[PDB]
Scaffold this active site. Sequence first.
Site, PDB file in Angstrom:
ATOM      1  N   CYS B  29       0.829  -1.214   0.000  1.00 11.35           N
ATOM      2  CA  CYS B  29       0.000   0.000   0.000  1.00 11.35           C
ATOM      3  C   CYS B  29       0.854   1.250   0.000  1.00 11.35           C
ATOM      4  CB  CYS B  29      -0.830   0.081   1.263  1.00 11.35           C
ATOM      5  SG  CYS B  29      -1.680  -1.391   1.753  1.00 11.35           S
ATOM      6  N   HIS B 199      -3.939   1.668   6.470  1.00 12.59           N
ATOM      7  CA  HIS B 199      -3.437   1.359   5.125  1.00 12.59           C
ATOM      8  C   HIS B 199      -3.366   2.568   4.199  1.00 12.59           C
ATOM      9  CE1 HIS B 199      -2.724  -2.485   6.355  1.00 12.59           C
ATOM     10  NE2 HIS B 199      -3.986  -2.757   6.628  1.00 12.59           N
ATOM     11  N   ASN B 219      -8.094   3.171  -4.081  1.00 18.01           N
ATOM     12  CA  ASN B 219      -7.492   1.986  -3.468  1.00 18.01           C
ATOM     13  C   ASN B 219      -6.652   1.228  -4.537  1.00 18.01           C
ATOM     14  OD1 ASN B 219      -6.966  -0.035  -1.589  1.00 18.01           O
ATOM     15  ND2 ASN B 219      -9.092  -0.549  -1.221  1.00 18.01           N
TER      16      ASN B 219
END
Lengths: 253, 253
Positions: B29, B199, B219
């Site tokens: 991430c 994250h 994302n």
Amino acid sequence: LPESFDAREQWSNCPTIAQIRDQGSCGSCWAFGAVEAMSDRICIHTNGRVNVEVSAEDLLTCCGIQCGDGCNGGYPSGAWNFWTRKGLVSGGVYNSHIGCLPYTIPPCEHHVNGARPPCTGEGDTPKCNKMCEAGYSTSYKEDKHYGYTSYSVSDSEKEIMAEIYKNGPVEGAFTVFSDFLTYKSGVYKHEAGDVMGGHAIRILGWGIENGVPYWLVANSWNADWGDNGFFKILRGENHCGIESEIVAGIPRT
Amino acid sequence: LPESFDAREQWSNCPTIAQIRDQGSCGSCWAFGAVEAMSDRICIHTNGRVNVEVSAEDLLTCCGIQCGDGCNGGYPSGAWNFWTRKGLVSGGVYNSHIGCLPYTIPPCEHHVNGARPPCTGEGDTPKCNKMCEAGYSTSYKEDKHYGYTSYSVSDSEKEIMAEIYKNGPVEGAFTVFSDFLTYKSGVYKHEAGDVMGGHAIRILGWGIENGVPYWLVANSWNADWGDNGFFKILRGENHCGIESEIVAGIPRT
């Protein structure tokens, strides 16, 4: 900048700097690193004139959603913002009866053996009660101390040292592995152990140990955990994210 | 500042902005939210003249200790630091054969019933080969794109908005609860579920949807997760710490 520097000596007139608190069975390191660093800086910035223990209890219980989930965890930079907007009342340690809201969660043993009950980790967040304990001279609203500004400090070693050296200890955070829990002395470098998440602290200096550069750090696990409650963690390597999440702020003086 | 702003609409000549990647079975991430936003910002900085996909493989494999630990998590601000110091090369998606070092870890299904193989826990960080893919025009070295500055943006809604508006997307991070994983659309406000961790993500806009202010976020779980790989998250009340860990940077000319 100096090769070594201890905030406790630079402002020896400022005793909050030297003090180790105990958060108890409540995951509120985020709240402790901030109010510790705010106390230190209210003393530093008025040049001795004002010396309060800022309430860990006011922060923890009255911040709300912008700070996190109280005893379950929270966010440093939300704390320093709160300070800037709603202020923080004074409050000494548990049973000290000093200040408006002394902390209401008792000391306990943090990954160490001693006389205090084991810490139990799971702990309710006290409700927000906007009222100074019986005996206190001023009202809650009157006792608020305010932040003038809050800010993050960029991941820059020399920039972190200049901020402390100029303006006082900072709040930071780092990833906690299980091998940290049993630190006693020397410089912490993570080696073995799994990951137990990120955790907020007060950074109050730096220096050099056997060539290893480190940061002088106050844990909030009472004075019998680690090196009388303090630890040294490796400097200059973003070791466990210690140079990544520095936040600070200047008191409304 | 406008009521709403989309980096995709504002710098539509720059197509990385609208692009969604897939980190695969590697908790990187931290790497993606970085290299996505640097790609955008190289393109924005040059008025579109330079349009590359900055390699997530380079940053993930070659950063070292300062970024954390590879496919096991890492720190955004170390990423942008490394970028200014060592630079990052081109690298397309998996099997793209675009640029110096495309990503060598394949796409997979992140908490959704689709046709790619489910994602296989976390993985093992690859080694750092300072060599491009056989067939690439330039050397690794000759293929580096450098940041000029990197910096943290303070927990300020207006500050963060002004940075995105003036310089483009930024990397951010936030605490993930179980109730996030099955996001489909609308504005995510955490109401239930267990923690899972903070994250990293890329933020690229804001707006208001049915009264509720949000951030437009990308994302790195492929386009079959969420709303085309994207989601909206409550803006203005440091929700899950979304306004707390903002990092960014200017491309070197």
